[PDB]
Design a protein around this ligand. Structure first.
Ligand SMILES: Nc1ncnc2c1ncn2[C@@H]1O[C@H](COP(=O)(O)O)[C@@H](O)[C@H]1O
Length: 715
């Protein structure tokens, strides 16, 4: 049933939903021609002033009976109003501009490590009100890459949530431009939080740093009693002032000028995925554009965002079931987690996939776990297997809009269809080297190139890298191979990076195989791997906890996995060479913490390579190396052993048989051996015994391994 209808029905029943319906008078004021970014924000936030804007889990400070005070979360959320959000943002800008010994002025850089929360959001806004350039850093970046980014940007202020404070300190000690360290998501009364700050200031004192440390609490309490800074900020370049850098990947900073940041705030990104009330959960760091799109789309539509309680997603279902969102934004790995929930719940009940009992599990997901108020849903940032899409769609009972886009280009398509605006022109470029051409069947393929109104001005302090991503006609080269399936309708194949050429000249799209194989019930996470010297694929598989218990982590989980991936291969119409033949089994999941997952939740190929690459190569190497060691052992001992043993071992080794299935009565034909492999075998035998053995003596169904051993001995 239609969206207008489902909304109308919700807003009759649900006063919370009714109060969150967008107000057009506010949107017209905030979006009018000429208004600078900071003024656009001020208009949304004052215009919706009384409404609930943001929500965090309520808590109480408990004592252990250790004695220590700690924050104990409650099954309840608490809201900060749009007006309260605006005040505290202004209190931050005011205190930062007016500081007595280390003030900050428009144009200066601020860097931040944090998750996503009320404080982080209010610091983002403070930055725009001050005209700062903000550089939000990846929560799982190593300290080395944090220092490298702090080097390029030279920030004057460094902000960090309590839990990243230690890595912030390390980075600030290596970064002479940093004058202040601000500490946020800080809770007065919590002993962990107080001792983190005291450790930060001892560490800085001990190294003799003059870097000042303050919590955001205190910054705001000071700012509150100060006059507001004047809008818009006195930057150098109006709408082209550099407002944000988003780091992408080696890390490059994509420049977001004020006019492109403004698109998050009620501009072109609301097309990315009637007057719908926006109530959303946010699980995505502000380090990544997906965090922003939800967060600012909802701020700018007068809705409410509910922040997930813990960085590590361990409170996911509880928060969704309390917050009961109207809009869902997913990424594949989140849909996979949902699918993994359904599937382990399916084992535990002992029900099959098509059944009423399984449909109740879905119903539970839809009504309880996800809150039962879902009106729309979208996904993006990585490719979704069609099976998973249909699963999510059946659970939610809405269409899952697919949005393709990038940090660089902004939103590019929505359910295959170019989003115009901002896209003005496009084309496909052939990629001969990866075997992709506009003449291909059944569809034209190649690299998508675009001209778009939201294209980045460039990468920060990287003019050469900036020139690499445009072709001679000024089209942006997405790096992404696509398939045109109808006029101006595209489907994603893969990044150019992710396409591998196997040694027999077949081309694989690696990220597409991971999406496909991620709906194996045995698979928790998968990374597929290739080498151009090899004719088959490997994979790094984290099996599910259930698979581990049932099969272990040795040959039996590999063999089970194999069957499972074969079955997807056949069902999806993939080739035999697209199925991995062996595995590295990992019992410890890829995480953001580990460096294997990005802040968006994507599996990072080069981080898999750096960790597992050696073990994977050694696994490619060992197959032929064992066989070669055996052939050499047999060559070396043959002038002193029963000719029949030689014949058997040679046959076993060459074809891939266990000694068990090599009987002296077996036919070379039985053990997998065509007449091409019989010539290799004849040559081997000729080399060690000095006697001629025709390929007739091996392939003839008259003969068997005694027959062969017989022939040789008669000479
Ligand atoms: N909806 C989507 N489907 C498939 N791949 C996607 C989608 N959105 C983004 N991507 C991939 O993610 C990249 C964006 O990377 P980033 O710059 O980190 O956001 C794109 O260039 C694609 O390779």
């Amino acid at each position: 049933q239609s969206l207008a209808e489902r909304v109308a029905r919700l807003v009759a029943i649900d006063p919370q939903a009714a109060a969150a319906v967008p107000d057009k008078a506010v949107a017209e004021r905030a979006t009018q021609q000429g208004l600078r970014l900071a003024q656009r924000i001020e208009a949304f936030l004052s215009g919706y002033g009384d409404r609930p804007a943001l929500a965090q889990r309520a808590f109480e400070i408990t004592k252990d009976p250790t004695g220590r005070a700690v924050a104990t979360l409650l099954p309840k959320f608490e809201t900060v109003s749009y007006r309260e959000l605006l005040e505290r943002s202004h209190a931050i800008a005011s205190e930062l501009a007016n500081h007595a010994e280390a003030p900050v002025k428009a144009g200066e850089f601020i860097a931040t490590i944090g998750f996503t929360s009320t404080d982080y959001t209010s610091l983002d806004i403070a930055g725009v009100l001050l005209g700062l350039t903000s550089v939000p850093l990846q929560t799982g970046a190593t300290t080395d890459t944090l220092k490298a980014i702090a080097e390029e940007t030279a920030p004057a202020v460094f902000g960090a949530s309590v839990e990243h404070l230690d890595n912030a300190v390390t980075t600030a000690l290596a970064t002479p431009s940093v004058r202040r360290l601000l500490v946020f998501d800080y809770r007065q009364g919590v002993d962990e939080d107080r001792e983190a700050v005291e450790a930060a200031r001892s560490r800085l004192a001990e190294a003799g740093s003059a870097v000042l440390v303050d919590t955001l609490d205190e910054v705001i309490a000071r700012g509150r009693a100060l006059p507001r800074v004047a809008l818009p900020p006195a930057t150098d370049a109006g709408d082209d002032s550099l407002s944000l850098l988003i780091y992408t990947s080696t890390p490059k900073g994509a420049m977001y000028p004020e006019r492109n940041v403004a698109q998050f705030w009620g501009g072109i990104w609301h097309n990315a995925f009637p007057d719908v009330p926006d109530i959303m959960v946010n699980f995505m760091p502000l380090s990544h554009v997906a965090g922003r799109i939800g967060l600012m789309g909802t701020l700018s539509s007068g809705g409410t965002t509910y922040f997930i309680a813990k960085s590590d997603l361990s409170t996911f279902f509880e928060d969704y079931s309390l917050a009961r969102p109207t809009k869902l934004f997913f990424v594949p790995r989140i849909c996979e987690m949902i699918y993994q929930h359904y599937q382990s719940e399916l084992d535990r009940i002992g029900a099959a996939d098509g059944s009423p009992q399984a449909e109740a599990i879905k119903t539970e997901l839809r009504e309880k776990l996800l809150g039962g108020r879902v009106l729309t849903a979208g996904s993006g940032s990585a490719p979704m297997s069609p099976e998973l899409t249909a699963f999510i769609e059946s659970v939610l009972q809405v269409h899952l809009v697919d949005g393709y886009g990038s940090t660089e280009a902004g939103p590019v398509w929505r359910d295959r269809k170019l989003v115009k605006p901002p896209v003005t022109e496009h084309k496909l470029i052939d990629v001969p080297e990866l075997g992709y051409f506009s003449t291909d069947s059944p569809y034209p393929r190649g690299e998508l190139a675009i001209k778009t109104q939201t294209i980045l001005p460039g990468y920060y302090k990287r003019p050469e890298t900036t020139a690499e991503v445009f072709d001679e006609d000024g089209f942006y080269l997405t790096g992404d191979v696509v398939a045109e399936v109808a006029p101006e309708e595209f489907v994603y194949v893969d990044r150019r990076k992710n396409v591998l050429k196997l040694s027999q000249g077949e081309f694989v799209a690696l990220s597409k195989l991971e999406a496909a194989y991620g709906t194996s019930p045995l698979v928790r996470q998968i990374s597929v791997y290739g080498s151009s010297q090899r004719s088959y694929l490997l994979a790094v598989v984290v099996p599910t906890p259930e698979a581990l218990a049932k099969y272990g982590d040795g040959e039996a989980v590999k063999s089970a996995l194999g069957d499972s991936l074969q079955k997807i291969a056949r069902e999806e119409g993939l080739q035999s060479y697209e199925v991995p033949r062996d595995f590295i089994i990992e019992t410890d999941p890829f995480t953001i913490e580990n460096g294997i997952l990005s802040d968006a939740g994507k599996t990072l190929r080069p981080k898999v390579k750096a960790r597992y690459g050696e073990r994977l190569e050694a696994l490619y190497a060992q197959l032929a190396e064992t066989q070669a060691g055996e052939l050499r052992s047999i060559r070396v001992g043959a002038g002193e052993r029963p000719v029949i043993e030689t014949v058997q071992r040679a046959a076993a080794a060459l074809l891939g048989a266990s000694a068990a299935e090599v009987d002296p009565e077996a036919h070379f034909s039985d053990l997998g051996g065509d007449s091409l492999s019989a010539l290799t075998y004849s040559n081997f035998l000729h080399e060690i015994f000095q006697v001629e053995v025709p390929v007739s003596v091996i392939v003839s169904a008259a003969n068997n391994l005694r027959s062969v051993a017989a022939h040789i001995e008669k000479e």
